[PDB]
Amino acid sequence: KKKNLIEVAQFLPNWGIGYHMAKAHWNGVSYEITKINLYKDGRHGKAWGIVHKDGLRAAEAPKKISGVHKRCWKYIPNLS
Amino acid sequence: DPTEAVKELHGKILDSVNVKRSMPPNALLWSLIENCRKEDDISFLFDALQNLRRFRLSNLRIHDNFNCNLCRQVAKTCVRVGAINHGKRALWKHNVHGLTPSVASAHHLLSYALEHKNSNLMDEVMKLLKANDLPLQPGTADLVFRICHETDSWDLLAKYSKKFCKAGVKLRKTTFDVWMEFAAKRGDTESLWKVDKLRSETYTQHTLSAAFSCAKGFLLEHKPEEAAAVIQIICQAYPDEKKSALEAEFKKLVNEWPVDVLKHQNEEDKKAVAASLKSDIPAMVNALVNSGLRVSVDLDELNKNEALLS
Amino acid sequence: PYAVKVGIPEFLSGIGGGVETHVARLETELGDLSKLLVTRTLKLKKFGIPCKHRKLILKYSQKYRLGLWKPRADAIKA
RNA sequence: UUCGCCCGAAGCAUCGGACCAAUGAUCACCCAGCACUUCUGUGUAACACUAGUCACACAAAGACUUUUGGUGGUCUUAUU
RNA sequence: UGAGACACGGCCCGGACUCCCACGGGGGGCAGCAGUGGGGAAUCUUGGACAAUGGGCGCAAGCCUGAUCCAGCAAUAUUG
RNA sequence: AAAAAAAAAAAAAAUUUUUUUUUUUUUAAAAAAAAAAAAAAUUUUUUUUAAGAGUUGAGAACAAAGUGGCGAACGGGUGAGUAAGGCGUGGGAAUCUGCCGAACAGUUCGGGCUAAAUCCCGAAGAAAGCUAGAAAGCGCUGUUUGAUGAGCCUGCGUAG
Numbered sequence: 001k002k003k004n005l006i007e008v009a010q011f012l013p014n015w016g017i018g019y020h021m022a023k024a025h026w027n028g029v030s031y032e033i034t035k036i037n038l039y040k041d042g043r044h045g046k047a048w049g050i051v052h053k054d055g056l057r058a059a060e061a062p063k064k065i066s067g068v069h070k071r072c073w074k075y076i077p078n079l080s
Numbered sequence: 081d082p083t084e085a086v087k088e089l090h091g092k093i094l095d096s097v098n099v100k101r102s103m104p105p106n107a108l109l110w111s112l113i114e115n116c117r118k119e120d121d122i123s124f125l126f127d128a129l130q131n132l133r134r135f136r137l138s139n140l141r142i143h144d145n146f147n148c149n150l151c152r153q154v155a156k157t158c159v160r161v162g163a164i165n166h167g168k169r170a171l172w173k174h175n176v177h178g179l180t181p182s183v184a185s186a187h188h189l190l191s192y193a194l195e196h197k198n199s200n201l202m203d204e205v206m207k208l209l210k211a212n213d214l215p216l217q218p219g220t221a222d223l224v225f226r227i228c229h230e231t232d233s234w235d236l237l238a239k240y241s242k243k244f245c246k247a248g249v250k251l252r253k254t255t256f257d258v259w260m261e262f263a264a265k266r267g268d269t270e271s272l273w274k275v276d277k278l279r280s281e282t283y284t285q286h287t288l289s290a291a292f293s294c295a296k297g298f299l300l301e302h303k304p305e306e307a308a309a310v311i312q313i314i315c316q317a318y319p320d321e322k323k324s325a326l327e328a329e330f331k332k333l334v335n336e337w338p339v340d341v342l343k344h345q346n347e348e349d350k351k352a353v354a355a356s357l358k359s360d361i362p363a364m365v366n367a368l369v370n371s372g373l374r375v376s377v378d379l380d381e382l383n384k385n386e387a388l389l390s
Numbered sequence: 391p392y393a394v395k396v397g398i399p400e401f402l403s404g405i406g407g408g409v410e411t412h413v414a415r416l417e418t419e420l421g422d423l424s425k426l427l428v429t430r431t432l433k434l435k436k437f438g439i440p441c442k443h444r445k446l447i448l449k450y451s452q453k454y455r456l457g458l459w460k461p462r463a464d465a466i467k468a
Numbered sequence: 469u470u471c472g473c474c475c476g477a478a479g480c481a482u483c484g485g486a487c488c489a490a491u492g493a494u495c496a497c498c499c500a501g502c503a504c505u506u507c508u509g510u511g512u513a514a515c516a517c518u519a520g521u522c523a524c525a526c527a528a529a530g531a532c533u534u535u536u537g538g539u540g541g542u543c544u545u546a547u548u
Numbered sequence: 549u550g551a552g553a554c555a556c557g558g559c560c561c562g563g564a565c566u567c568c569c570a571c572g573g574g575g576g577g578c579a580g581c582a583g584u585g586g587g588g589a590a591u592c593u594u595g596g597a598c599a600a601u602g603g604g605c606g607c608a609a610g611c612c613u614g615a616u617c618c619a620g621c622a623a624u625a626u627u628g
Numbered sequence: 629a630a631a632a633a634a635a636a637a638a639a640a641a642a643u644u645u646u647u648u649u650u651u652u653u654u655u656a657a658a659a660a661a662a663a664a665a666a667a668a669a670u671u672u673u674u675u676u677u678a679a680g681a682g683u684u685g686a687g688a689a690c691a692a693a694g695u696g697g698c699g700a701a702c703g704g705g706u707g708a709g710u711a712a713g714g715c716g717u718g719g720g721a722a723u724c725u726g727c728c729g730a731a732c733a734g735u736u737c738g739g740g741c742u743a744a745a746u747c748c749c750g751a752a753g754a755a756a757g758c759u760a761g762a763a764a765g766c767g768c769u770g771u772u773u774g775a776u777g778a779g780c781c782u783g784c785g786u787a788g
């Protein structure tokens with residue numbers, strides 16, 4: 001079964017804050033995690049991030065990430 | 081299967097976390113660490129760590145991993161009982177237990193590997209160090225050279241000495257002594273003078289065991305004059321504190337050194353080295369007694385060794 | 391993911407819904423897929439194709455000629 | 469069809485206790501976290517001959533702070 | 549409940565009638581389109597398609613639509 | 629178990645060879661999970677279990693059952709009641725109005741339903757998010773408006 005953003009961030013040190021998360025079909029965009037609002041079960045929650053366009057930061061203040069519980073998320077090992 | 085301190089401690093935690101929804105005291109986690117006794121009870125400890133990490137983020141809003149000493153102690157407890165797989169899981173960079181890999185956890189794993197004579201456990205612990213991006217340190221080099229002394233692994237010596245020298249670490253005196261004495265055990269003369277040159281680049285003045293190994297390398301060339309001068313200048317520059325230790329090392333010459341240096345040769349080279357040592361080491365003892373050194377040796381142990389009749 | 395070489399049977403099997411029973415008749419009487427893409431309802435009615443199957447064939451012919459739909463290549467092993 | 473009595477299903481409404489079950493506010497108390505102090509234990513690096521000396525994290529305690537989570541009280545029961 | 553109902557094919561209650569029930573109890577409302585008994589001198593098919601027009605939902609693709617459109621029965625009507 | 633392009637000619641044939649980009653690893657330039665059985669000098673061939681798992685990489689349906697939104701207040705039927713709270717016609721003030729058109733402002737943070745939400749609760753000021761697959765496109769909220777409907781009232785006219 002595929003993993004959402006929370007189920008990927010469980011196998012990450014410091015809960016994935018500081019890492020670049022992206023959906024699997026995305027091509028050249030990721031979010032740099034700033035806050036994770038974990039729920040009770042440990043598999044669902046919210047997320048806040050910094051958007052990066054082509055590896056370059058495009059926004060100043062973080063924003064809440066849409067589609068966190070969609071089972072298509074991954075972390076980029078190269079950008080982070 | 082579980083020890084009862086541990087089943088009770090695990091529960092009191094998984095009950096605070098899950099039923100009361102409040103953080104337990106740290107003492108309960110630390111006593112679950114201190115009271116682990118058998119291999120099966122540290123799966124209970126890892127379940128506790130996962131549940132406490134989930135609670136720390138979920139209720140306390142703590143993203144951070146478990147701190148350094150806690151990771152040191154969970155690794156040393158995982159290896160004190162003797163579960164090495166979950167012991168080496170503390171070196172993983174990506175884990176659901178909040179464990180930060182450190183040099184100290186690898187030092188515990190390599191201390192076990194030294195104390196239990198485990199040669200491949202070097203290879204897994206060092207591949208875990210490289211995989212999980214931890215830096216290479218002089219104490220790691222100390223432990224690695226000490227274990228590959230005791231396991232008859234020259235390939236590990238060459239590979240990891242190249243890795244450590246490329247990494248730019250500063251090797252201590254003791255690991256240099258271990259390297260020179262093991263190359264004396266094996267008989268690589270060119271490597272012996274190579275590491276002597278490298279340590280002369282590193283430090284200036286010789287110590288006991290390395291001038292000792294230099295004398296071993298010169299005696300392998302059947303040139304007892306330079307060896308005698310080297311141990312002369314290392315004996316003059318000491319007080320009389322280690323008079324029993326130098327006699328113990330001369331007993332090491334007359335007991336254990338020829339066996340170790342002729343296990344790794346061929347049979348005609350065994351005959352040649354047996355004859356060469358039988359010609360040189362009585363002259364070496366007579367030279368040392370002539371130069372003024374009062375050293376108690378057993379020359380009968382030359383013929384009492386079962387290796388030296390090859 | 392779509393069929394590279396598309397004929398009448400690939401087209402009708404990509405439509406689905408039981409319309410692939412008329413593959414042999416449409417191969418016999420129309421032959422070419424490009425003739426089928428401009429066939430209209432009276433010709434299909436003369437060939438013995440019912441009302442819903444006719445409407446499906448005409449719908450997917452219009453979709454195919456505009457690029458809006460292609461038959462999938464996964465229907466290759468029967 | 470209308471009027472006077474008796475009964476009063478469901479339901480809207482109005483009360484009343486009730487801290488019923490939540491929610492909110494406000495008190496304490498308990499862990500835990502951030503900064504702090506240590507003659508404490510356990511590690512890493514110099515050095516020193518094996519002892520010092522820094523740097524860590526101690527959660528290992530401390531104690532006013534302040535926060536996240538709980539628990540136990542109150543609200544002329546404050547909103548359901 | 550809802551923007552909108554005190555809501556034909558929603559809910560609650562009471563009543564008459566009716567169908568199951570394993571017998572404890574449940575269920576129903578053609579004055580929607582067809583159709584059947586009955587009453588009457590007397591009044592039709594248990595049809596086809598969503599192609600058109602109109603409507604609901606959907607970004608669309610579409611999906612629903614007995615609205616409708618169109619066939620069937622009847623000298624019932626019509627300057628044929 | 630990566631993206632793009634080409635493969636038609638001499639001495640039983642679906643999937644391979646070549647060229648350019650790209651992620652990572654191995655020994656500063658190049659090269660490219662565990663177990664069983666076999667072969668070779670660590671690799672390859674076949675098979676079992678993988679995968680609450682140092683991110684398993686794409687894909688297809690999920691209708692399979694639901695939560696939620698919008699619509700089931702329209703359309704369709706009948707004329708039982710109703711003699712004026714109805715209807716016809718003309719007016720009015722003390723109101724609301726989904727969808728639709730046009731401006732402006734926002735769309736922040738916690739908790740609950742075994743799991744989640746555009747569902748429910750709380751705080752500010754009211755809210756709700758989805759989509760780099762629908763990323764400046766939808767949606768929601770507040771305030772001004774147009775449009776359309778609805779509620780309320782009333783003059784006159786309307787059986788025996």
Ligand SMILES: [K+]
Pocket residue numbers: 598
């Ligand atoms: K239609």
Ligand SMILES: [K+]
Pocket residue numbers: none
């Ligand atoms: K007649």
Ligand SMILES: [Mg+2]
Pocket residue numbers: none
């Ligand atoms: Mg009552």
Ligand SMILES: [Mg+2]
Pocket residue numbers: 550
């Ligand atoms: Mg509605």
Ligand SMILES: [Mg+2]
Pocket residue numbers: 550
């Ligand atoms: Mg209402």
Ligand SMILES: [Mg+2]
Pocket residue numbers: 556557578
């Ligand atoms: Mg009905």
Ligand SMILES: [Mg+2]
Pocket residue numbers: 578
């Ligand atoms: Mg009827």
Ligand SMILES: [Mg+2]
Pocket residue numbers: 588
């Ligand atoms: Mg009759």
Ligand SMILES: [Mg+2]
Pocket residue numbers: none
């Ligand atoms: Mg239409």
Ligand SMILES: [Mg+2]
Pocket residue numbers: none
């Ligand atoms: Mg629309």
Ligand SMILES: [Mg+2]
Pocket residue numbers: 614
């Ligand atoms: Mg019809």
Ligand SMILES: [Mg+2]
Pocket residue numbers: none
């Ligand atoms: Mg006529």
Ligand SMILES: [Mg+2]
Pocket residue numbers: 558700
């Ligand atoms: Mg209805």
Ligand SMILES: [Mg+2]
Pocket residue numbers: none
């Ligand atoms: Mg109606």
Ligand SMILES: [Mg+2]
Pocket residue numbers: none
């Ligand atoms: Mg009609």
Ligand SMILES: [Mg+2]
Pocket residue numbers: none
């Ligand atoms: Mg009428």
